[PDB]
Design a protein around this ligand. Sequence first.
Ligand SMILES: Nc1ncnc2c1ncn2[C@@H]1O[C@H](COP(=O)(O)O)[C@@H](O)[C@H]1O
Length: 533
Amino acid sequence: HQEVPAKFNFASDVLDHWADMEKAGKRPPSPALWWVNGKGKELMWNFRELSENSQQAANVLSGACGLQRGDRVAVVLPRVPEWWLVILGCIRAGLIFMPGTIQMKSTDILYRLQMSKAKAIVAGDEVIQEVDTVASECPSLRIKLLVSEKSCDGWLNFKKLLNEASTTHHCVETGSQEASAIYFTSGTSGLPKMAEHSYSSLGLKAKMDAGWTGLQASDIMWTISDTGWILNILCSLMEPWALGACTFVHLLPKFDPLVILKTLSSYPIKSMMGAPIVYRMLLQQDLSSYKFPHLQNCVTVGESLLPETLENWRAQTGLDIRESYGQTETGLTCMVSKTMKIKPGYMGTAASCYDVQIIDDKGNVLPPGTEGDIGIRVKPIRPIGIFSGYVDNPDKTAANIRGDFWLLGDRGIKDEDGYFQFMGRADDIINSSGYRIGPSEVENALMEHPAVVETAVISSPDPVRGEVVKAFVVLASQFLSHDPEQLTKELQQHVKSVTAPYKYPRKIEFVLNLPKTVTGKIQRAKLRDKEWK
Ligand SMILES: Nc1ncnc2c1ncn2[C@@H]1O[C@H](COP(=O)(O)O)[C@@H](O)[C@H]1O
């Protein structure tokens, strides 16, 4: 049970307010989206232009391609303006957007399209061939839209159709609880589940949290994110547009820290958001060389922000990094807001919607200073911002509910002021830099190679990255005197060729056997614990 309005839509109820203020003279033409590719190309939309161009996107999707309300649309694009336009187009047209990384390989794509029964895919040059290798095995797939300077056989040209579309689209009166997005998300075993979010659980939640980052109406925010991470919708798109502020996007084709640094320095970015890895990469560059006195707000999420990183960023930039915490299923769950005291090692207090607590094995609230499982209260009232459940899987949504709480699956401690301290994943999920990684994903990849008879993938501390994927591998006898160095590279490349490279095992250790339960199941917890002093 939720306490929401009957109807909500981020495009019509927020974005178009800002456009209408411009049309009617109440506000000057303000920048909404500012994009750069780093090679001398830039593009900017004001809120009216964004409204119009996104209405053209809705018309392409629902008119030219005839996609109907409730249809599921896979979106697999790099950091190009068309991503923002296509997501907004889906929201208007009542279509369910399902973003994924351009890193994906064909088997990743097959899995997503088959599991979701996607009716359409919107892709770029990066994944054409990957999609086409598997498209014919997907009987629900009816539309393929390509965003590219090139035309290609079998694919509709998105850019050409966008330009032909009317700038007037009548926004669908979408319901608050109505499906708006599906984000695939990795689990402790098996393959990614489909996390469904509603019009309100993304957009109304965003409108309510708007400003938490310290951003204001006339500022520019840069969210540095894979376009497949829920972070991109929540912070790159909805936070700034809730406030009438500009969002900044850099193609960052190669994710180069020096490019990031010159960008911060050269453009009047007032707020920035990124995973801790971003900050750690910048701290290795020459900060003295590229100053950014316009930068005021530095926020982070996705991984644990080490006190070490916080301290160094302060020392070198004079700025605080304010940590936040969440997951795909819950969005922004805790944070350090602008006016809150920073506590090194602590990821903040409850987001305004949420009763976040530390809880015991029977579902009860624990006192400050005691370790347990982090949760959000969802009975008898589910707060605005929680997802709708895992699609086609009511059992696995039930499995994460304990008493009245949704379990985030992270251990934690709460202090005397309500600040949460992350104490590690309670299960086998791995966190490598941005990304959330399911051990079965990497294990399946590894098992396809003939040198691997048995394997267990787990998380491993790394002094330069924080946390990385490690594979323990039992070799077939005939590989026992290969060069371990060379074989490791081979297996690493193997994984990179069969699934999205972010999950490759950056460490491998060869062993004669793995630990097993009394019914033969591999004990990852045991290996993990060893790996961490
Ligand atoms: N501030 C943080 N500290 C530690 N872990 C985090 C933090 N933010 C996110 N995570 C991890 O990332 C998971 C969510 O990943 P995703 O659902 O891909 O956004 C959480 O359950 C945590 O395990």
